[PDB]
């Protein structure tokens, strides 16, 4: 669970003055984030946390300095495990960074499961929407279920190297074919 023990080791919550530890501190943090969003099937997350904070819903002790969360956040993305968003999967970093998409699995990977949705079945010729391979009745042991359209796109897009599959845009939406 989002109960990794250390999650309550007081010092975690304060940037360590020790270089090699400072490091571990972060990486550990990154590691926590991750598994909470997995297990408790979370998707996106702020700089607060999704109600409750990962950086302080541990108010039942203390909480991480924002200045840090940031530094963490970064190195959490530079590593490519968290994704910066706002309302649309992109950056510029301000009016364009508030929530974050989180990757249990990679991207160029996370499609290979969507795709292998179709592969494992065959309905690949077909055309279906995002609000479908999601929220509908294709919520089997495909941990991409309930996943948000707005991100969903992001994962499909890799389902197109030079050798693709393809979307059904709109100057207002999207949905796909394989």
């Amino acid at each position: 669970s989002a109960l990794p023990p250390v999650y309550s080791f007081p010092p975690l919550y304060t940037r360590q003055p020790n270089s090699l530890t400072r490091r571990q501190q972060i990486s550990t943090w990154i590691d926590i984030i991750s598994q909470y969003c997995k297990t408790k099937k979370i998707w996106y997350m702020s700089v607060d946390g999704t109600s409750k904070n990962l950086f302080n819903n541990e108010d039942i002790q203390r909480s991480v300095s924002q200045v840090f969360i940031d530094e963490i956040w970064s190195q959490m993305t530079k590593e490519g495990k968290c994704l910066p968003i706002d309302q649309s999967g992109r950056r510029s970093s301000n009016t364009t960074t508030t929530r974050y998409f989180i990757l249990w699995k990679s991207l160029d990977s996370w499609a290979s499961l969507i795709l292998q949705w179709f592969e494992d079945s065959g309905k690949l010729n077909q055309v279906i929407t995002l609000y479908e391979l999601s929220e509908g009745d294709e919520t089997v042991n495909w941990e991409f279920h309930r996943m948000p359209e707005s991100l969903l796109y992001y994962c499909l897009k890799p389902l197109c190297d030079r050798n693709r599959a393809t979307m059904l845009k709109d100057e207002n939406d999207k949905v796909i074919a394989i």
């Binding site: 003055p17 020790n18 270089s19 090699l20």
Partner: protein, 169 residues
């Protein structure tokens, strides 16, 4: 290509000694130009030796590794030796201990104000001829320091390194 299923023990060693001596050499001299070395802490040239060249061949115990490694000399394997340094450093190396300490100092010297991590980067992420692997780096750093060959600058941050060019022994 044989499993730990020989019969007269001090062979498997003799031999096992041989296998290692290669595993080790197979990890550096390759380079066109020769000036490189590999100093290496036993314990590591151990998870290396096994995890690598010996998961199916027959995994071995530490005592063995040691026993083995301690043989090189005798077997006419003369490109590496095992040696206690000070009385704490245990390693098989390719040069006199000192002449490696030297090369460190000297380099630390060049980039002074060094963090382990940095000392690492110079020594590792710049590919160029290094077999420095953490631990033995780590270990040697501590000699210099004790031997007083290096001046420490211990901060809450971590320990920064410099060349004891001022209070000589």
């Amino acid at each position: 290509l044989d499993r730990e299923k020989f019969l007269n023990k001090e062979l498997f060693l003799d031999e096992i000694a041989r296998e290692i001596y290669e595993f080790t050499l197979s990890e550096f001299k390759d380079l066109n130009s020769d000036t490189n070395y590999m100093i290496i802490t036993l314990v590591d040239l151990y998870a290396m030796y096994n995890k690598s060249m010996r998961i199916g061949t027959g995994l071995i115990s530490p005592m063995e590794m040691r026993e083995a490694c301690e043989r090189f000399e005798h077997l006419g394997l003369n490109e590496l030796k095992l040696v206690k340094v000070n009385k704490r450093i245990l390693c098989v190396t390719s040069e006199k201990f000192d002449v490696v300490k030297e090369k460190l100092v000297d380099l630390i010297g060049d980039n002074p104000g060094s963090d382990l991590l940095r000392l690492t980067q110079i020594l590792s992420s710049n590919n160029s001829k290094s077999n420095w692997t953490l631990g033995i780096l780590m270990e040697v750093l501590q000699n210099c320091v004790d031997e007083g060959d290096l001046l420490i600058d211990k901060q809450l941050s971590g320990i920064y390194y410099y060349k004891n060019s001022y209070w000589p022994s």
